[PDB]
Design a protein around this nucleic acid. Structure first.
Lengths: 122, 365
RNA sequence: GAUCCUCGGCGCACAGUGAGGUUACUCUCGCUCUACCUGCAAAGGUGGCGGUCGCGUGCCUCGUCUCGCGGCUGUAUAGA
Protein backbone atom coordinates (compact mmCIF):
# COMPACT_ATOMS: atom_id res chain seq x y z
CA UNK A 1 0.00 0.00 0.00
CA UNK A 2 1.13 3.57 -0.79
CA UNK A 3 -0.03 5.65 2.19
CA UNK A 4 2.21 3.41 4.33
CA UNK A 5 5.44 5.33 4.85
CA UNK A 6 7.67 2.74 6.57
CA UNK A 7 7.88 -0.97 7.51
CA UNK A 8 6.46 -2.25 10.83
CA UNK A 9 7.62 -5.73 11.98
CA UNK A 10 4.89 -7.89 13.56
CA UNK A 11 6.44 -7.76 17.04
CA UNK A 12 5.95 -3.98 17.02
CA UNK A 13 2.49 -4.29 15.46
CA UNK A 14 1.48 -6.51 18.41
CA UNK A 15 3.06 -4.15 20.94
CA UNK A 16 0.93 -1.40 19.39
CA UNK A 17 -2.37 -3.31 19.65
CA UNK A 18 -1.44 -4.09 23.28
CA UNK A 19 -0.67 -0.42 23.95
CA UNK A 20 -4.10 0.52 22.65
CA UNK A 21 -5.98 -2.01 24.87
CA UNK A 22 -4.31 -0.84 28.05
CA UNK A 23 -5.12 2.71 26.97
CA UNK A 24 -8.84 1.91 26.67
CA UNK A 25 -8.72 0.58 30.18
CA UNK A 26 -6.56 3.11 32.00
CA UNK A 27 -6.39 6.19 29.76
CA UNK A 28 -8.24 7.90 26.95
CA UNK A 29 -8.33 6.83 23.30
CA UNK A 30 -10.13 8.03 20.15
CA UNK A 31 -11.45 5.48 17.65
CA UNK A 32 -12.35 6.09 13.99
CA UNK A 33 -10.71 8.18 11.25
CA UNK A 34 -12.73 11.35 11.78
CA UNK A 35 -12.15 11.37 15.54
CA UNK A 36 -8.47 10.56 15.00
CA UNK A 37 -8.28 13.47 12.60
CA UNK A 38 -9.78 15.89 15.15
CA UNK A 39 -7.35 14.57 17.74
CA UNK A 40 -4.41 15.50 15.50
CA UNK A 41 -5.86 18.83 14.37
CA UNK A 42 -6.32 19.65 18.11
CA UNK A 43 -2.86 18.34 19.08
CA UNK A 44 -4.24 16.02 21.73
CA UNK A 45 -2.93 12.75 20.27
CA UNK A 46 0.41 11.29 21.47
CA UNK A 47 0.41 8.34 19.07
CA UNK A 48 -1.63 7.70 15.91
CA UNK A 49 -2.32 4.13 14.71
CA UNK A 50 -3.21 3.49 11.06
CA UNK A 51 -4.40 0.18 9.56
CA UNK A 52 -2.75 -1.11 6.36
CA UNK A 53 -5.83 -2.67 4.73
CA UNK A 54 -8.12 0.40 4.37
CA UNK A 55 -10.41 -0.08 1.37
CA UNK A 56 -10.32 2.96 -0.34
CA UNK A 57 -6.65 3.70 0.56
CA UNK A 58 -7.25 7.43 0.40
CA UNK A 59 -9.56 7.43 3.45
CA UNK A 60 -6.56 7.66 5.80
CA UNK A 61 -4.04 9.12 3.33
CA UNK A 62 -4.26 12.57 4.90
CA UNK A 63 -3.04 11.37 8.31
CA UNK A 64 0.67 11.01 7.57
CA UNK A 65 0.67 14.56 6.15
CA UNK A 66 -1.34 15.91 9.09
CA UNK A 67 0.66 14.20 11.82
CA UNK A 68 3.92 15.57 10.42
CA UNK A 69 2.62 19.16 10.55
CA UNK A 70 1.56 18.70 14.18
CA UNK A 71 4.63 16.49 14.91
CA UNK A 72 2.59 13.59 16.29
CA UNK A 73 4.10 10.13 15.68
CA UNK A 74 2.09 7.51 13.79
CA UNK A 75 2.37 3.74 13.37
CA UNK A 76 0.81 1.00 11.26
CA UNK A 77 -1.01 -2.26 12.01
CA UNK A 78 -1.93 -4.85 9.37
CA UNK A 79 -5.60 -5.47 10.19
CA UNK A 80 -8.33 -2.88 10.62
CA UNK A 81 -10.63 -5.52 12.11
CA UNK A 82 -7.88 -6.28 14.63
CA UNK A 83 -7.42 -2.60 15.59
CA UNK A 84 -11.14 -2.03 16.04
CA UNK A 85 -11.50 -5.23 18.04
CA UNK A 86 -8.59 -4.05 20.17
CA UNK A 87 -10.36 -0.67 20.55
CA UNK A 88 -13.27 -2.33 22.39
CA UNK A 89 -15.46 -2.47 19.30
CA UNK A 90 -16.97 -5.43 17.54
CA UNK A 91 -16.52 -3.78 14.16
CA UNK A 92 -13.40 -2.73 12.22
CA UNK A 93 -11.59 0.60 12.54
CA UNK A 94 -9.33 2.29 9.97
CA UNK A 95 -7.33 4.49 12.34
CA UNK A 96 -7.15 5.32 16.04
CA UNK A 97 -5.36 7.67 18.43
CA UNK A 98 -4.00 7.51 22.01
CA UNK A 99 -4.68 10.77 23.86
CA UNK A 100 -3.53 9.72 27.32
CA UNK A 101 -1.55 6.48 27.68
CA UNK A 102 -2.21 5.89 31.39
CA UNK A 103 -0.83 2.43 32.22
CA UNK A 104 0.87 2.14 28.85
CA UNK A 105 3.19 5.12 29.11
CA UNK A 106 6.24 2.87 29.21
CA UNK A 107 4.81 0.72 26.41
CA UNK A 108 4.04 3.74 24.17
CA UNK A 109 7.41 5.41 24.82
CA UNK A 110 9.12 2.30 23.50
CA UNK A 111 6.97 2.36 20.36
CA UNK A 112 7.47 6.07 19.60
CA UNK A 113 11.19 5.32 19.91
CA UNK A 114 11.34 2.16 17.81
CA UNK A 115 9.50 3.94 14.95
CA UNK A 116 12.10 6.68 15.24
CA UNK A 117 14.94 4.19 14.75
CA UNK A 118 13.36 2.45 11.78
CA UNK A 119 12.69 5.89 10.35
CA UNK A 120 16.21 7.36 10.65
CA UNK A 121 16.97 9.69 13.60
CA UNK A 122 19.48 9.43 16.53
CA UNK B 1 2.79 -44.49 15.22
CA UNK B 2 4.65 -43.26 12.14
CA UNK B 3 4.15 -42.79 8.40
CA UNK B 4 3.53 -46.11 6.63
CA UNK B 5 1.12 -45.18 3.83
CA UNK B 6 3.00 -44.61 0.56
CA UNK B 7 0.37 -44.09 -2.15
CA UNK B 8 1.51 -40.64 -3.26
CA UNK B 9 3.03 -41.85 -6.53
CA UNK B 10 0.04 -44.12 -7.24
CA UNK B 11 -2.56 -41.33 -7.20
CA UNK B 12 -4.36 -40.70 -10.49
CA UNK B 13 -4.79 -36.99 -9.80
CA UNK B 14 -4.78 -35.71 -13.40
CA UNK B 15 -7.86 -37.89 -14.03
CA UNK B 16 -9.69 -37.05 -10.79
CA UNK B 17 -13.49 -36.86 -10.94
CA UNK B 18 -14.58 -33.39 -9.80
CA UNK B 19 -17.97 -32.10 -8.65
CA UNK B 20 -19.49 -29.19 -6.74
CA UNK B 21 -22.69 -29.05 -4.68
CA UNK B 22 -24.39 -25.73 -4.00
CA UNK B 23 -25.91 -25.04 -0.58
CA UNK B 24 -28.62 -22.51 0.23
CA UNK B 25 -26.48 -21.33 3.13
CA UNK B 26 -23.98 -18.49 3.40
CA UNK B 27 -20.32 -19.20 4.14
CA UNK B 28 -19.47 -22.76 5.12
CA UNK B 29 -16.73 -22.41 7.74
CA UNK B 30 -15.89 -26.05 8.33
CA UNK B 31 -16.54 -29.58 7.13
CA UNK B 32 -16.11 -32.75 9.17
CA UNK B 33 -16.15 -36.24 7.69
CA UNK B 34 -16.91 -39.49 9.50
CA UNK B 35 -15.16 -42.72 8.54
CA UNK B 36 -15.73 -46.16 10.15
CA UNK B 37 -21.26 -45.76 5.48
CA UNK B 38 -19.54 -42.36 5.34
CA UNK B 39 -20.85 -38.98 6.52
CA UNK B 40 -19.97 -35.30 6.22
CA UNK B 41 -21.06 -32.44 8.46
CA UNK B 42 -21.04 -28.78 7.47
CA UNK B 43 -21.46 -25.62 9.51
CA UNK B 44 -22.09 -22.06 8.36
CA UNK B 45 -22.12 -18.45 9.53
CA UNK B 46 -25.85 -18.70 8.75
CA UNK B 47 -26.08 -20.95 11.84
CA UNK B 48 -26.89 -24.11 9.87
CA UNK B 49 -25.52 -27.57 10.60
CA UNK B 50 -26.02 -30.07 7.79
CA UNK B 51 -25.44 -33.82 7.43
CA UNK B 52 -24.54 -35.53 4.16
CA UNK B 53 -24.18 -39.11 3.01
CA UNK B 54 -20.97 -39.31 1.00
CA UNK B 55 -20.59 -43.10 0.81
CA UNK B 56 -21.48 -43.24 -2.90
CA UNK B 57 -18.39 -41.82 -4.61
CA UNK B 58 -20.26 -41.95 -7.94
CA UNK B 59 -22.78 -39.31 -6.87
CA UNK B 60 -22.45 -35.97 -5.08
CA UNK B 61 -22.96 -35.64 -1.28
CA UNK B 62 -26.54 -36.57 -0.41
CA UNK B 63 -28.24 -34.19 2.04
CA UNK B 64 -29.89 -36.11 4.87
CA UNK B 65 -30.82 -33.73 7.67
CA UNK B 66 -30.21 -30.20 8.89
CA UNK B 67 -30.58 -28.12 12.04
CA UNK B 68 -30.66 -24.34 12.04
CA UNK B 69 -30.03 -22.11 15.03
CA UNK B 70 -30.95 -18.47 15.52
CA UNK B 71 -31.93 -15.47 17.63
CA UNK B 72 -34.38 -17.66 19.57
CA UNK B 73 -31.28 -19.13 21.23
CA UNK B 74 -29.86 -16.01 22.89
CA UNK B 75 -29.29 -16.84 26.59
CA UNK B 76 -25.20 -19.51 27.34
CA UNK B 77 -26.52 -23.05 27.72
CA UNK B 78 -29.48 -23.04 25.31
CA UNK B 79 -29.58 -25.96 22.88
CA UNK B 80 -29.07 -23.89 19.74
CA UNK B 81 -26.56 -21.60 18.03
CA UNK B 82 -27.14 -17.84 17.87
CA UNK B 83 -23.79 -16.63 16.55
CA UNK B 84 -21.49 -17.79 13.72
CA UNK B 85 -20.59 -21.48 13.87
CA UNK B 86 -16.86 -21.63 13.17
CA UNK B 87 -16.01 -25.31 13.50
CA UNK B 88 -17.39 -28.85 13.48
CA UNK B 89 -15.99 -32.29 14.36
CA UNK B 90 -17.56 -35.73 13.99
CA UNK B 91 -16.90 -38.18 16.83
CA UNK B 92 -14.82 -41.24 15.80
CA UNK B 93 -17.48 -43.60 17.18
CA UNK B 94 -20.24 -42.38 14.85
CA UNK B 95 -22.50 -41.30 17.69
CA UNK B 96 -21.78 -37.58 18.01
CA UNK B 97 -21.09 -34.42 16.07
CA UNK B 98 -19.96 -31.34 18.00
CA UNK B 99 -20.12 -27.72 16.89
CA UNK B 100 -18.74 -24.46 18.24
CA UNK B 101 -18.29 -20.82 17.30
CA UNK B 102 -18.59 -17.19 18.31
CA UNK B 103 -21.32 -17.83 20.90
CA UNK B 104 -18.76 -19.44 23.22
CA UNK B 105 -20.56 -22.79 23.37
CA UNK B 106 -19.76 -26.35 22.48
CA UNK B 107 -22.90 -28.12 21.33
CA UNK B 108 -22.84 -31.90 20.97
CA UNK B 109 -25.54 -33.40 18.79
CA UNK B 110 -26.56 -36.98 18.14
CA UNK B 111 -25.83 -38.09 14.57
CA UNK B 112 -29.09 -40.07 14.65
CA UNK B 113 -31.64 -37.28 14.97
CA UNK B 114 -29.36 -34.25 14.55
CA UNK B 115 -30.52 -33.09 17.97
CA UNK B 116 -28.52 -31.41 20.75
CA UNK B 117 -27.70 -33.96 23.46
CA UNK B 118 -25.39 -31.72 25.49
CA UNK B 119 -24.33 -28.07 25.65
CA UNK B 120 -21.00 -27.20 27.29
CA UNK B 121 -20.14 -23.50 27.68
CA UNK B 122 -16.55 -22.24 27.78
CA UNK B 123 -17.55 -19.89 30.62
CA UNK B 124 -15.36 -17.08 29.29
CA UNK B 125 -16.63 -13.89 27.65
CA UNK B 126 -13.82 -14.16 25.10
CA UNK B 127 -13.80 -17.94 24.71
CA UNK B 128 -15.01 -18.29 21.13
CA UNK B 129 -14.48 -21.78 19.73
CA UNK B 130 -12.16 -21.58 16.72
CA UNK B 131 -11.29 -25.21 15.98
CA UNK B 132 -12.07 -28.77 17.05
CA UNK B 133 -10.22 -32.07 16.77
CA UNK B 134 -11.02 -35.45 18.25
CA UNK B 135 -8.22 -37.72 19.30
CA UNK B 136 -8.48 -40.53 16.76
CA UNK B 137 -10.27 -43.68 17.95
CA UNK B 138 -11.33 -41.86 21.12
CA UNK B 139 -14.04 -39.65 22.62
CA UNK B 140 -11.46 -37.12 23.80
CA UNK B 141 -12.10 -33.73 22.19
CA UNK B 142 -9.77 -30.74 21.88
CA UNK B 143 -11.14 -27.23 21.31
CA UNK B 144 -8.82 -24.34 20.48
CA UNK B 145 -10.30 -21.03 21.59
CA UNK B 146 -9.94 -17.28 21.16
CA UNK B 147 -8.98 -16.52 24.77
CA UNK B 148 -5.60 -18.16 24.12
CA UNK B 149 -6.62 -21.41 25.84
CA UNK B 150 -7.08 -24.95 24.57
CA UNK B 151 -9.88 -26.81 26.35
CA UNK B 152 -10.09 -30.60 26.54
CA UNK B 153 -13.23 -32.71 26.98
CA UNK B 154 -14.41 -36.26 27.51
CA UNK B 155 -17.39 -36.48 25.17
CA UNK B 156 -19.16 -39.51 26.64
CA UNK B 157 -18.87 -37.81 30.02
CA UNK B 158 -20.09 -34.58 28.42
CA UNK B 159 -17.63 -32.82 30.71
CA UNK B 160 -14.64 -30.51 30.61
CA UNK B 161 -11.42 -32.22 31.61
CA UNK B 162 -8.89 -29.38 31.65
CA UNK B 163 -7.43 -26.21 30.15
CA UNK B 164 -4.06 -25.74 28.41
CA UNK B 165 -2.14 -22.45 28.41
CA UNK B 166 0.74 -21.24 26.25
CA UNK B 167 -0.39 -19.22 23.23
CA UNK B 168 -0.18 -15.43 23.11
CA UNK B 169 -2.82 -14.90 20.42
CA UNK B 170 -5.95 -16.71 19.27
CA UNK B 171 -5.47 -20.42 18.68
CA UNK B 172 -6.70 -20.59 15.11
CA UNK B 173 -6.17 -24.24 14.28
CA UNK B 174 -5.63 -27.54 16.08
CA UNK B 175 -4.82 -31.05 14.84
CA UNK B 176 -4.68 -34.44 16.55
CA UNK B 177 -4.10 -38.11 15.74
CA UNK B 178 -4.31 -41.25 17.87
CA UNK B 179 -1.88 -40.25 20.62
CA UNK B 180 -3.10 -38.20 23.56
CA UNK B 181 -1.47 -35.08 22.14
CA UNK B 182 -2.21 -32.17 19.80
CA UNK B 183 -0.67 -29.45 17.62
CA UNK B 184 -1.97 -25.89 17.76
CA UNK B 185 -1.14 -22.68 15.90
CA UNK B 186 -1.29 -19.24 17.46
CA UNK B 187 -1.70 -16.99 14.44
CA UNK B 188 0.14 -13.75 15.22
CA UNK B 189 2.31 -15.33 17.93
CA UNK B 190 3.83 -17.14 14.96
CA UNK B 191 4.32 -20.31 16.96
CA UNK B 192 3.10 -23.87 16.64
CA UNK B 193 2.82 -25.81 19.87
CA UNK B 194 2.89 -29.55 20.52
CA UNK B 195 0.92 -30.52 23.61
CA UNK B 196 1.78 -33.81 25.29
CA UNK B 197 -1.27 -34.04 27.56
CA UNK B 198 -0.21 -36.98 29.76
CA UNK B 199 3.37 -35.75 30.22
CA UNK B 200 2.12 -32.27 31.16
CA UNK B 201 4.72 -30.77 28.81
CA UNK B 202 4.74 -28.81 25.55
CA UNK B 203 7.05 -28.10 22.63
CA UNK B 204 7.22 -24.67 21.01
CA UNK B 205 8.14 -24.05 17.38
CA UNK B 206 8.72 -20.54 16.04
CA UNK B 207 8.21 -18.88 12.67
CA UNK B 208 8.10 -15.17 11.89
CA UNK B 209 11.53 -15.04 10.28
CA UNK B 210 12.72 -11.59 9.20
CA UNK B 211 13.05 -11.57 5.36
CA UNK B 212 16.13 -9.34 5.48
CA UNK B 213 17.75 -11.85 7.84
CA UNK B 214 16.66 -14.80 5.68
CA UNK B 215 18.08 -13.10 2.59
CA UNK B 216 21.22 -12.37 4.57
CA UNK B 217 21.76 -16.04 5.39
CA UNK B 218 20.71 -17.07 1.88
CA UNK B 219 23.56 -15.06 0.40
CA UNK B 220 25.86 -17.69 1.92
CA UNK B 221 25.46 -19.61 -1.35
CA UNK B 222 10.88 -13.37 0.61
CA UNK B 223 7.43 -12.52 1.98
CA UNK B 224 6.70 -11.31 5.51
CA UNK B 225 5.03 -13.83 7.78
CA UNK B 226 2.55 -12.18 10.13
CA UNK B 227 0.40 -15.16 11.02
CA UNK B 228 0.62 -18.95 11.12
CA UNK B 229 -2.97 -19.87 10.39
CA UNK B 230 -3.33 -23.58 9.73
CA UNK B 231 -1.87 -26.86 10.95
CA UNK B 232 -2.16 -30.58 10.28
CA UNK B 233 -0.41 -33.57 11.82
CA UNK B 234 1.05 -36.16 9.42
CA UNK B 235 2.27 -38.61 12.07
CA UNK B 236 3.07 -38.69 15.79
CA UNK B 237 6.47 -37.10 15.05
CA UNK B 238 5.83 -34.59 12.25
CA UNK B 239 3.44 -31.81 11.27
CA UNK B 240 2.72 -29.12 8.67
CA UNK B 241 1.74 -25.46 9.01
CA UNK B 242 0.36 -22.84 6.64
CA UNK B 243 0.90 -19.09 6.87
CA UNK B 244 -0.57 -15.89 5.44
CA UNK B 245 2.53 -15.47 3.28
CA UNK B 246 1.87 -18.68 1.38
CA UNK B 247 4.44 -20.72 3.27
CA UNK B 248 3.78 -24.41 3.82
CA UNK B 249 6.23 -25.65 6.43
CA UNK B 250 7.15 -29.19 7.40
CA UNK B 251 8.29 -29.58 11.00
CA UNK B 252 9.77 -32.42 13.01
CA UNK B 253 9.30 -32.59 16.79
CA UNK B 254 13.09 -32.85 17.15
CA UNK B 255 13.93 -29.62 15.30
CA UNK B 256 13.43 -26.03 16.43
CA UNK B 257 13.08 -24.65 12.90
CA UNK B 258 11.03 -26.07 10.03
CA UNK B 259 12.77 -29.02 8.38
CA UNK B 260 11.36 -27.82 5.07
CA UNK B 261 9.61 -24.78 3.58
CA UNK B 262 7.68 -24.30 0.35
CA UNK B 263 7.30 -20.55 -0.01
CA UNK B 264 4.26 -18.95 -1.69
CA UNK B 265 2.80 -22.42 -2.27
CA UNK B 266 -0.30 -21.01 -3.96
CA UNK B 267 1.45 -18.23 -5.84
CA UNK B 268 0.70 -14.51 -5.78
CA UNK B 269 -2.19 -12.12 -6.73
CA UNK B 270 3.06 -4.63 -5.34
CA UNK B 271 3.25 -8.38 -4.74
CA UNK B 272 0.81 -10.13 -2.41
CA UNK B 273 0.98 -13.87 -1.67
CA UNK B 274 -2.05 -16.16 -1.37
CA UNK B 275 -2.65 -17.21 2.24
CA UNK B 276 -2.87 -20.87 3.09
CA UNK B 277 -6.45 -21.18 4.32
CA UNK B 278 -6.63 -24.96 4.39
CA UNK B 279 -4.26 -27.82 5.14
CA UNK B 280 -4.99 -31.52 5.60
CA UNK B 281 -2.45 -34.31 5.93
CA UNK B 282 -4.13 -37.68 5.58
CA UNK B 283 -2.90 -39.52 8.71
CA UNK B 284 0.34 -41.52 8.52
CA UNK B 285 0.64 -41.09 4.76
CA UNK B 286 3.06 -39.18 2.53
CA UNK B 287 0.39 -37.01 0.92
CA UNK B 288 -1.19 -33.77 2.09
CA UNK B 289 -3.58 -31.29 0.50
CA UNK B 290 -3.51 -27.51 0.66
CA UNK B 291 -6.06 -24.86 -0.21
CA UNK B 292 -6.36 -21.11 -0.59
CA UNK B 293 -8.62 -18.97 -2.74
CA UNK B 294 -6.47 -19.23 -5.86
CA UNK B 295 -8.77 -21.65 -7.66
CA UNK B 296 -7.23 -25.05 -6.98
CA UNK B 297 -6.44 -27.66 -4.33
CA UNK B 298 -2.74 -28.52 -4.32
CA UNK B 299 -1.82 -32.12 -3.55
CA UNK B 300 1.70 -32.70 -2.26
CA UNK B 301 3.89 -35.72 -1.50
CA UNK B 302 6.32 -36.00 1.39
CA UNK B 303 9.72 -37.63 0.86
CA UNK B 304 10.27 -41.12 2.27
CA UNK B 305 13.05 -39.56 4.34
CA UNK B 306 10.58 -36.96 5.67
CA UNK B 307 12.97 -34.10 4.85
CA UNK B 308 10.90 -32.51 2.08
CA UNK B 309 7.63 -32.49 0.17
CA UNK B 310 6.85 -32.03 -3.51
CA UNK B 311 3.94 -31.02 -5.73
CA UNK B 312 2.00 -34.09 -6.89
CA UNK B 313 -0.73 -32.16 -8.67
CA UNK B 314 -3.63 -29.72 -8.73
CA UNK B 315 -7.41 -30.06 -8.46
CA UNK B 316 -8.50 -27.06 -10.50
CA UNK B 317 -12.28 -27.19 -10.06
CA UNK B 318 -11.93 -25.71 -6.58
CA UNK B 319 -12.74 -22.02 -7.07
CA UNK B 320 -13.64 -19.93 -4.03
CA UNK B 321 -12.27 -19.67 -0.51
CA UNK B 322 -11.45 -23.14 0.78
CA UNK B 323 -12.31 -23.09 4.48
CA UNK B 324 -11.75 -26.75 5.38
CA UNK B 325 -10.55 -29.96 3.71
CA UNK B 326 -11.28 -33.60 4.60
CA UNK B 327 -10.35 -36.88 2.93
CA UNK B 328 -12.34 -40.11 3.06
CA UNK B 329 -11.53 -43.51 1.52
CA UNK B 330 -13.10 -46.72 0.22
CA UNK B 331 -10.36 -44.74 -3.75
CA UNK B 332 -9.87 -41.30 -2.19
CA UNK B 333 -12.59 -38.67 -1.90
CA UNK B 334 -11.50 -35.14 -1.11
CA UNK B 335 -14.23 -32.93 0.31
CA UNK B 336 -13.73 -29.21 0.80
CA UNK B 337 -15.99 -26.49 2.14
CA UNK B 338 -16.06 -23.48 -0.18
CA UNK B 339 -17.28 -20.05 0.89
CA UNK B 340 -17.26 -16.46 -0.36
CA UNK B 341 -15.60 -15.40 2.88
CA UNK B 342 -12.72 -16.40 5.13
CA UNK B 343 -13.88 -18.46 8.15
CA UNK B 344 -12.91 -15.84 10.70
CA UNK B 345 -13.73 -12.65 8.84
CA UNK B 346 -10.26 -11.78 7.57
CA UNK B 347 -10.92 -9.56 4.58
CA UNK B 348 -10.36 -10.96 1.10
CA UNK B 349 -10.24 -8.72 -1.96
CA UNK B 350 -11.56 -10.22 -5.22
CA UNK B 351 -12.09 -13.94 -4.80
CA UNK B 352 -12.47 -15.32 -8.32
CA UNK B 353 -15.40 -17.69 -8.72
CA UNK B 354 -16.69 -16.94 -5.23
CA UNK B 355 -19.42 -19.41 -4.33
CA UNK B 356 -21.05 -21.42 -1.55
CA UNK B 357 -20.94 -25.20 -1.32
CA UNK B 358 -19.01 -28.46 -1.24
CA UNK B 359 -16.18 -29.41 -3.60
CA UNK B 360 -15.60 -33.11 -4.22
CA UNK B 361 -12.72 -34.90 -5.94
CA UNK B 362 -12.43 -38.65 -6.45
CA UNK B 363 -8.91 -39.97 -7.06
CA UNK B 364 -7.94 -43.54 -8.01
CA UNK B 365 -4.99 -45.81 -7.22
C1' G C 1 -26.37 53.38 4.74
C1' A C 2 -28.95 50.85 8.08
C1' U C 3 -29.96 49.76 13.16
C1' C C 4 -32.49 46.61 16.38
C1' C C 5 -37.25 44.87 18.28
C1' U C 6 -41.97 42.57 17.19
C1' C C 7 -44.82 40.13 14.18
C1' G C 8 -45.94 38.08 9.81
C1' G C 9 -44.85 35.31 5.66
C1' C C 10 -42.18 31.86 3.85
C1' G C 11 -36.43 26.28 5.90
C1' C C 12 -35.57 23.62 9.12
C1' A C 13 -29.58 21.07 5.47
C1' C C 14 -25.87 21.32 11.31
C1' A C 15 -22.69 19.97 16.86
C1' G C 16 -19.29 15.11 18.92
C1' U C 17 -18.54 10.33 20.12
C1' G C 18 -17.83 5.56 18.66
C1' A C 19 -19.51 -1.08 16.48
C1' G C 20 -23.17 -2.05 16.65
C1' G C 21 -26.56 -4.04 14.76
C1' U C 22 -28.95 -6.91 10.64
C1' U C 23 -30.60 -19.51 1.79
C1' A C 24 -32.97 -17.93 -2.44
C1' C C 25 -32.27 -17.09 -7.44
C1' U C 26 -30.44 -17.75 -12.70
C1' C C 27 -28.77 -20.87 -16.54
C1' U C 28 -27.61 -25.70 -18.94
C1' C C 29 -28.13 -31.15 -18.64
C1' G C 30 -30.71 -35.23 -18.54
C1' C C 31 -34.33 -37.54 -15.48
C1' U C 32 -41.46 -43.94 -16.08
C1' C C 33 -43.80 -44.98 -18.69
C1' U C 34 -47.02 -47.06 -22.54
C1' A C 35 -51.70 -49.06 -25.51
C1' C C 36 -56.22 -48.12 -25.10
C1' C C 37 -60.30 -46.18 -23.99
C1' U C 38 -64.03 -42.88 -20.29
C1' G C 39 -62.93 -38.82 -23.18
C1' C C 40 -64.09 -31.41 -26.58
C1' A C 41 -59.42 -30.31 -23.74
C1' A C 42 -58.59 -31.47 -19.38
C1' A C 43 -59.75 -35.00 -16.59
C1' G C 44 -60.89 -40.68 -15.22
C1' G C 45 -60.44 -45.81 -15.88
C1' U C 46 -58.67 -50.28 -18.04
C1' G C 47 -54.45 -52.31 -20.28
C1' G C 48 -48.54 -52.43 -20.45
C1' C C 49 -44.30 -53.13 -17.63
C1' G C 50 -42.79 -54.36 -12.89
C1' G C 51 -42.75 -56.08 -8.26
C1' U C 52 -44.87 -58.88 -4.43
C1' C C 53 -46.49 -63.41 -1.39
C1' G C 54 -49.11 -68.44 -1.60
C1' C C 55 -48.86 -72.35 -4.74
C1' G C 56 -48.09 -75.29 -8.48
C1' U C 57 -44.38 -75.98 -11.53
C1' G C 58 -39.38 -77.55 -16.09
C1' C C 59 -33.21 -79.90 -14.56
C1' C C 60 -29.31 -88.21 -17.51
C1' U C 61 -27.15 -80.49 -13.40
C1' C C 62 -34.00 -82.23 -11.18
C1' G C 63 -29.60 -77.64 -6.19
C1' U C 64 -30.82 -73.12 -8.36
C1' C C 65 -32.83 -71.03 -11.87
C1' U C 66 -37.29 -71.89 -15.75
C1' C C 67 -42.59 -71.31 -16.16
C1' G C 68 -47.33 -69.82 -14.83
C1' C C 69 -51.24 -69.05 -11.86
C1' G C 70 -54.57 -66.76 -7.16
C1' G C 71 -54.14 -62.26 -3.98
C1' C C 72 -52.22 -57.15 -4.59
C1' U C 73 -49.44 -53.48 -6.03
C1' G C 74 -46.89 -49.88 -8.35
C1' U C 75 -41.77 -47.75 -5.89
C1' A C 76 -34.95 -46.65 -10.92
C1' U C 77 -29.38 -46.07 -10.31
C1' A C 78 -30.23 -41.22 -9.12
C1' G C 79 -28.84 -36.51 -10.17
C1' A C 80 -25.86 -33.22 -12.29
Amino acid sequence: ASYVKFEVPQDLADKVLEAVRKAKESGKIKKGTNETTKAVERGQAKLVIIAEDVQPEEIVAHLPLLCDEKKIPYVYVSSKKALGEACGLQVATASAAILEPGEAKDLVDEIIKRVNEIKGKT
Amino acid sequence: GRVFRYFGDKLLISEAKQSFTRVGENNLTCISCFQPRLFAYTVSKDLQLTKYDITDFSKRPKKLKYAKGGAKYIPNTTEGHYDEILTVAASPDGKYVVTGGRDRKLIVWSTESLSPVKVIPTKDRRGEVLSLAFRKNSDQLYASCADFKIRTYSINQFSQLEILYGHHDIVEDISALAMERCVTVGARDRTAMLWKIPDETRLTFRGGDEPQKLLRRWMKEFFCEGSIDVVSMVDDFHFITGSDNGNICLWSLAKKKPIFTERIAHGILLLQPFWITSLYAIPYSNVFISGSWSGSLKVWKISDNLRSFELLGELSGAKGVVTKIQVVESKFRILASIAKEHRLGRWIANVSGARNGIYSAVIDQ
